[PDB]
Design an enzyme around this catalytic site. Structure first.
Site, PDB file in Angstrom:
ATOM      1  N   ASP A  24     -16.549 -93.602  26.067  1.00 15.05           N
ATOM      2  CA  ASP A  24     -15.153 -92.988  25.645  1.00 15.05           C
ATOM      3  C   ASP A  24     -15.334 -93.348  24.125  1.00 15.05           C
ATOM      4  O   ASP A  24     -15.041 -94.114  23.327  1.00 15.05           O
ATOM      5  CB  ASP A  24     -14.322 -93.889  26.213  1.00 15.05           C
ATOM      6  N   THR A  25     -15.328 -92.303  23.452  1.00 11.91           N
ATOM      7  CA  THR A  25     -15.789 -92.057  21.761  1.00 11.91           C
ATOM      8  C   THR A  25     -14.410 -92.502  20.950  1.00 11.91           C
ATOM      9  O   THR A  25     -14.655 -92.644  19.817  1.00 11.91           O
ATOM     10  CB  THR A  25     -15.899 -90.722  21.582  1.00 11.91           C
ATOM     11  N   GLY A  26     -13.500 -92.558  21.774  1.00 13.67           N
ATOM     12  CA  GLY A  26     -12.223 -92.876  21.083  1.00 13.67           C
ATOM     13  C   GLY A  26     -11.742 -94.264  21.258  1.00 13.67           C
ATOM     14  O   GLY A  26     -10.766 -94.471  20.792  1.00 13.67           O
TER      15      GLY A  26
END
Lengths: 99, 99
Positions: free
Chosen positions: A25-27
């Site tokens: 999850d990049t966020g």
């Protein structure tokens, strides 16, 4: 190899030999998991998500196996609805967001 | 081109010509922004994040400009601490998670 985002980019990691399903999850700045015991040696936290904050236990130089790689890194443990591997672990894994 | 995850993968999008700073975020199914008015035509929601849920306004076939691309897609509006473009908009943008 690659993850196209039509499906959730989900994977299996062994943290200290226990296996967990994590969403890459990049966020997230960090990685929060629930369901595993990392022990006594932690500094507590408070993480912010969408709808509030949660209380977590911060663990350093934790053994992680994932994608045929052996990595050491920081993980938090706590009240997460979904297990995430944040940007801290994806840099380590050699991941990029391509387009 | 690429985003390596050493820095937050953040970008500028124009939703209906207003410009907003969004985090490209693999870990979201949807995209929630705050700060912009999309109008009267919406179906409400409830989104789940880490620490709770929030109340949002769901908008379809919304004009989005971002990365020299013109896209139409669904956006939610509400109480988000950070603006996110979820997996719904990244598939549309042609993005992948590479390693």
């Amino acid at each position: 190899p690659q993850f196209s985002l039509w499906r959730r980019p989900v994977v299996t990691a062994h943290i200290e030999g226990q296996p967990v399903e994590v969403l890459l999850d990049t966020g997230a700045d960090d990685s929060i998991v629930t369901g595993i015991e990392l022990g006594p040696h932690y500094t507590p936290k408070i993480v912010g998500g969408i709808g509030g904050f949660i209380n977590t236990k911060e663990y350093k130089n934790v053994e992680i196996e994932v994608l045929g790689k052996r990595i050491r890194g920081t993980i938090m443990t706590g009240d997460t609805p979904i297990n995430i591997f944040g940007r801290n672990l994806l840099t380590a894994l050699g991941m990029s967001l391509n387009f």
